[PDB]
Structure formats: C-alpha cells, structure tokens
Design a protein around this ligand. Sequence first.
Ligand SMILES: Cc1ccccc1Oc1cc(-n2c(=O)cc(C(F)(F)c3ccccc3)[nH]c2=O)c(F)cc1C#N
Ligand SMILES: Cc1ccccc1Oc1cc(-n2c(=O)cc(C(F)(F)c3ccccc3)[nH]c2=O)c(F)cc1C#N
Ligand SMILES: *Cc1c(COP(=O)(O)O)cnc(C)c1O
Ligand SMILES: *Cc1c(COP(=O)(O)O)cnc(C)c1O
Ligand SMILES: [Mg+2]
Lengths: 362, 362
Amino acid sequence: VGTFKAKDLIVTPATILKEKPDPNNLVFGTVFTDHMLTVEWSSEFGWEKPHIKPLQNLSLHPGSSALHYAVELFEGLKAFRGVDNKIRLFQPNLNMDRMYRSAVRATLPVFDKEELLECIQQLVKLDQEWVPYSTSASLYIRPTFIGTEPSLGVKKPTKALLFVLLSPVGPYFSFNPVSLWANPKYVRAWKGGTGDCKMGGNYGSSLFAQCEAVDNGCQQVLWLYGEDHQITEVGTMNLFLYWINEDGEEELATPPLDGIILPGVTRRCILDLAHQWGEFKVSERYLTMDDLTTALEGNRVREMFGSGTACVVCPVSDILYKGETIHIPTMENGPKLASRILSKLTDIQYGREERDWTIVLS
Amino acid sequence: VVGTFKAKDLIVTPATILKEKPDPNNLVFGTVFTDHMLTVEWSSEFGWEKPHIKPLQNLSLHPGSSALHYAVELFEGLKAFRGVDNKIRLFQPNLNMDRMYRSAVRATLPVFDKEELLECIQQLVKLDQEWVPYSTSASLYIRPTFIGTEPSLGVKKPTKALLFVLLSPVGPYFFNPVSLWANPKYVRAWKGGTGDCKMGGNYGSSLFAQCEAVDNGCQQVLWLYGEDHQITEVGTMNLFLYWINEDGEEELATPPLDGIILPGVTRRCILDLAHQWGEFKVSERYLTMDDLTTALEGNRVREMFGSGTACVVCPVSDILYKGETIHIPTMENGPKLASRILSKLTDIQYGREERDWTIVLS
Ligand SMILES: Cc1ccccc1Oc1cc(-n2c(=O)cc(C(F)(F)c3ccccc3)[nH]c2=O)c(F)cc1C#N
Ligand SMILES: Cc1ccccc1Oc1cc(-n2c(=O)cc(C(F)(F)c3ccccc3)[nH]c2=O)c(F)cc1C#N
Ligand SMILES: *Cc1c(COP(=O)(O)O)cnc(C)c1O
Ligand SMILES: *Cc1c(COP(=O)(O)O)cnc(C)c1O
Ligand SMILES: [Mg+2]
C-alpha cells in the first residue's frame, strides 16, 4: 500500500504540437491534446513515478486483464476557461473519491487522491491552451485505470496503468431535448452489482440497447429496473423528475442510491442547490413508469431531465414505451427549473460567481 | 468494405528466435504464451483487413480504445489436445465460434465468418503445434479475444476493432477439490444482463468476490441469485449436483439457461453423455442453498462439481455460507460420476476413441 507523488512528476514535452480545433466544430471525445499522464504500478515495487509525456498509443501485453475481464474504471470531469480567463476545475475532489472507491471495487490498487488531483492539474496546466476560448466549450478530463497483468488468470491484478487523457469538447447542444427508449428487456445494473461505480463493465453491456435506441430515433436509453419498471437513469445521466407528487406537493424527485444508481457529481450539486433554495420538496425516492403515466394523465409533471458532466442538464421531451410515444411537457414548462440549474452551474464553472465548488488551476 | 476476413488471405511473419517450451508438469494456467499470435484489424470505413500470424508482441492501442473505457470486449476458451496417436485435435470448436459470434452481436462488435476464423485458428495452432504438450494430462489453451479500438470516448458502436488469438500451454488443473465462497451480497449476472455471453464486463464486476473468496481459503465463488439463493455457477464453471432429489430419484441437476448461466460447451457435453447413459434422471432445474442443506442433512447428496474447458470437472468439497463451513461429500462418494465424466471426455479429447466432437488439426 503506497502512492505516486506529484513532486516526482517527470515531464517530457512534445516537440511537435498539434493545431487546436475550432471551438464551435467540436465532436465530443474525438480530439486529444498534446500530452497525457501515465503512472505504472506493480504488486512487487508499487507505484512508479508519474509521467507527463506526449499522447501516444499504449503498449499492452495482449494478455492484459483490461482486455479479457474488463479490469478497468474511468472518470469524467472538466476544466473551464473563465470570463476572467482563469481556468477552473469543478468539484474535482468528488471525482477522486469516486475513482478511489471504483478502484477498491475493481481490486485495482489504491492511490493518494490529492497526489492524483495535483498530477491532473499539472497536465491541464501544461496543455492549458487546449482549454477552449469559449463560454460554451470545456476541456474533458478522462482519468482511466486498467489491469495490465500479462496472464489469463482470474485474479487481483499484479500490474496496472493509471493514465489521464484531455479532450476539448463543445456544448452538448450544438436546449435540444432527448427522446428516451424504454425497453424492460435490458437491465443496466442489479443489486449486488457494480452499477454504483464507474467501472468499464457497466457500459459494454449497455451498448446494444443504445444502438437499438438510436435505431428508433432516441438519443438515450431509459434504464428500467424490477417488476414495477422503476425509472433509474437517463442513459449515461442521473434522472430528475420535477412534478406535483401524490400528496399534491411540488417536488424534485430522483432515484435513491440503493446500489443501481451511479452517484453523479451533477446529481449531488442539483440536490444541494434544491435543498439550499428550500422552495419545494426534495425526495430521493422510487419512481415507476406507472407513477409517471399517472402523473402525466393528471397534468402533475413539469420537467424531466438527465444530469451529468457532459450535458449539466438534458431535458427529456418523450419516452418510447410498449409501442407508444409518451410526451413529457418539459419544454412547455420553460423548462424553468432545468434553465435555473444550467444557469447556476454554468455561472460557477466559468467564474461568473465565486464558489466553494471550483479550484483555480495550479 | 470487406465484410469478413478469409484464411486464404493469411499473411505469416514467422518468429526468427523460438522460445524453449515449458515442462508440462510445472505449468501455471495462462502465464506461458507460444511464439505466434493471430491479429485481424477491422474499421467501419474499409471493413476487415487481411489476417496476420506474427510473433507474439504487445498490442499498440490508442489510449481512447473503447475496450479500456467501456469494456467493449469478449473472449473465448477452447483447447487443442495431442492424441495417444500423436494427432492434434480440437474439441467442439464450432460451438466456440457460434458463442463468440453471438457475443460479438450483443457487444456490437463487427460480425466475422465463423469458418474463416476457425481456419485461421487451425493455421496458428499448426504453426505453433510443438507447443501442444507431449502429455495425456496437458493441453494448449486457445484464447480468441475481440476488442473495440475506436480512438474516441463517445458511448456508441465501435468503428474500429481488433480480433486476436493467443495460445497458452496449460496443465491438468490450474482431483484436488475446491472450497466455495457463498456470499449473497454479490450477484454475478441478472435477467436482462449479459451473463449468458463471454463479455469481459461480466468478469471485472465479479473480481472483488473472487479476491474475498481467496482471502477466506476458497478457490471459487458460489454465485447466488434471487431471494431464495439459487446456486447458479461454480465461479468460472457451470454447476452440477448429483443427488437423490425431493421425489427420492437419483438425479444429475444443473441450472437452466434462463439468461444468468453461461451456456458451457462442457455442460452441453455432460448433459448429452448423461442422457445417453440413461442411468439416472437428468434435469435442467433451479437449485437453492435450502435444497442443498436439506439434502445434506438427509444424506441425499453424492457429488457436486463445476464444468468448464479449463478443468473439465472440478469436484466441490466445501461451501462457506453464513459464517459456517458446509461439507459436500463428493470425494467420499468416489467421486464416481465426476471420474466417469472426466475419463469419457479425456478419452475423446486425446483420441482414445472416435467422436463427432473432435476435429483433427488441418
Ligand atoms: C490456484 C487454484 C487452485 C485450485 C483451483 C483453482 C485455482 O486457480 C484459480 C483459477 C481460476 N480460473 C482462471 O484463472 C481462469 C479461468 C479461465 F480462463 F478458464 C476462464 C476465465 C473466465 C471465464 C471462464 C474461464 N478459469 C478459472 O477457473 C479462478 F477463477 C480462480 C482460481 C483460484 N483460486
Ligand atoms: C453528444 C450528444 C448530444 C445530443 C444528442 C446525442 C449525443 O450523442 C450521444 C452522446 C452520448 N454520450 C457519450 O458518448 C459519452 C458520455 C460520457 F463520456 F460523458 C460518459 C461515458 C460513460 C459514462 C458517463 C458519461 N456521455 C454521453 O451522453 C451518448 F451516450 C449517446 C449519444 C447519442 N445519441
Ligand atoms: C457518470 C455517470 C453519471 C453522471 O455522473 P456525473 O458525475 O454527474 O458526470 C450518471 N449515470 C451513469 C451511469 C454514469 O456513468
Ligand atoms: C466460460 C464459462 C463457463 C463454461 O464454459 P465452457 O464452454 O464449458 O468452457 C461457465 N461459466 C462461466 C461464467 C463461463 O465464463
Ligand atoms: Mg464463408
């Protein structure tokens, strides 16, 4: 049990630098910056010194457990060029906490969260000109952690690689609301599974349903669970419902963290803002398709949206379920709460207001 | 685009320095690799490249490869056997090709011609045929692997992939019976999931329980499902119970293929042999911990074993469950059925008798 240290960083600058992309013509996760972070681990010697070096292919033994048994996890967070031209991270300590927890569940080696964050800051700082000159674009940060043991054995890995990629990304909407594909045949996560960690294995099994969604003109899967068809996640995003509940109370509701919900940073921020405002009830509670269709019949639904680093908030206009299209009146209700949340989080991200939730770059 | 690769297009780059073969008695499963590997590249733009047999080398993967982030990956496991007549045989290899194709469709990886892949695998084994051990208790493990290599972080069907095959000489095990760790907190697979496919994501999520098993002196996890604790899989192997059932009938029972069971080639072969012998009832049926503990109290259990390519038959002696050790009297009952199955399958594998289940190396 040990850690790499940022003070040990070895920095090999690229001698040929790539042209930055047009900030308006950015496709998510396709353009990479000049440099990457790599840190090697072995059970025999522990963590090697961390390296910032030119973006390169990984050289992996074809037996690597990441390729056979998905011994792997990732994170997603962003750097933002402020209205004051200062680059900020947003709640990055929550990403480090989740990455450490995911590592323990994956049986990958633990590391010092502060040392990783400082290595990430030094990587962003070196490639800081890649943080887009735009109030609607950002630099996506992809910490990734893979088993690299050259053996086919099913066992705790004795070799691993922690790396970080940087990708300039545009606004999710280049509010264009999403249509959701609701097919109960496919289950994202089960009680006693890894659905509450950002482990690669949760996503490979989800691709088929996503291609079926797209084949039916939908952008995301509505992940249903159990005999009562609980609504759990809006594809890669946490699920919020703003409605009049069964007791006639104005309520912001989201599924509870009972093992099948990824605990989103954005979700946490939205719940914290909603509690802070104290203008309506805030409930972590089960929501079923029946609860939703009963509410829609009673004109009790105001807004439905996903939350995530990639979108901030993603309004939902429609659900395809049992061969019918179910309208959700989000965009006919402003969407007032969705807009307020987007405006608040964006104002914090781009330094339009001071917050405990941002760190100015190292 | 080229819709499938063809074996007739094989490009063979032989190794100029060959490695010393291992002692067949000193083999740790899946740690020793032969001189050569098969690699076939795919892109959406051009389709399948020509297949290559070349020296075992590291893979050069874009660090954005979806195999590393979203477990876009699957694998197979089959064996070559050097016969008593010195002819090298494969065992039901077309069942592996069928399962790999099915797993590829569910993974959204590109389809391939099953006959062309098998012919490429035969040509690889033929080149490295001296690696097929000179022993009636050792074999050559064949590890077809299929990974997404798309250099982009988007969640979607991969537009780039690599199909590769590794060869690894393995010994008779990895009868020394196994102790099973039964903890219902962890679930291997769920209805609506991918547990009936050999997708990497099914194994990364299962690793924590296996490391907890080993920490408690157990070699495999007994995978429990549902509120009645159905016994589903003996770790990486299908589960067989030989017992006097509730009706007082001698019975060989295995869980049914209801979506949470990997449809094992060995399982299929054992059911076929058992039906052919007709000496007891053969049942694909649910089995619970309560069924098992009630049977053990009534002295109704004869044998419990796992089945899989890697072991053939793996007798079970003990289950750790709710802080107690439960003895299974497998090794005090011969184990007569386990021995008979092992003897029959190895007689077929090593060419001691003719069978529709083996193919002589092309
Ligand atoms: C040391 C020892 C003593 C006694 C019994 C077993 C032992 O070793 C183990 C081997 C395995 N083990 C693999 O390492 C790989 C495969 C596979 F590659 F064949 C496969 C992978 C994935 C899916 C199917 C098969 N099978 C499999 O059982 C394991 F999971 C756990 C242990 C333990 N402990
Ligand atoms: C961009 C867009 C805007 C509007 C309409 C469609 C869009 O395209 C999609 C993007 C995504 N998509 C990702 O590709 C990757 C992430 C992630 F990298 F942020 C992540 C990964 C894994 C887990 C969490 C987040 N998020 C995410 O939403 C998707 F899943 C589906 C579609 C569709 N159709
Ligand atoms: C990453 C993720 C989220 C959102 O997490 P954020 O930290 O808000 O970006 C939601 N659901 C799933 C399944 C996820 O993987
Ligand atoms: C591969 C596998 C089996 C059995 O496979 P065989 O085809 O008999 O080698 C059983 N259970 C699991 C979980 C597996 O991955
Ligand atoms: Mg053909």
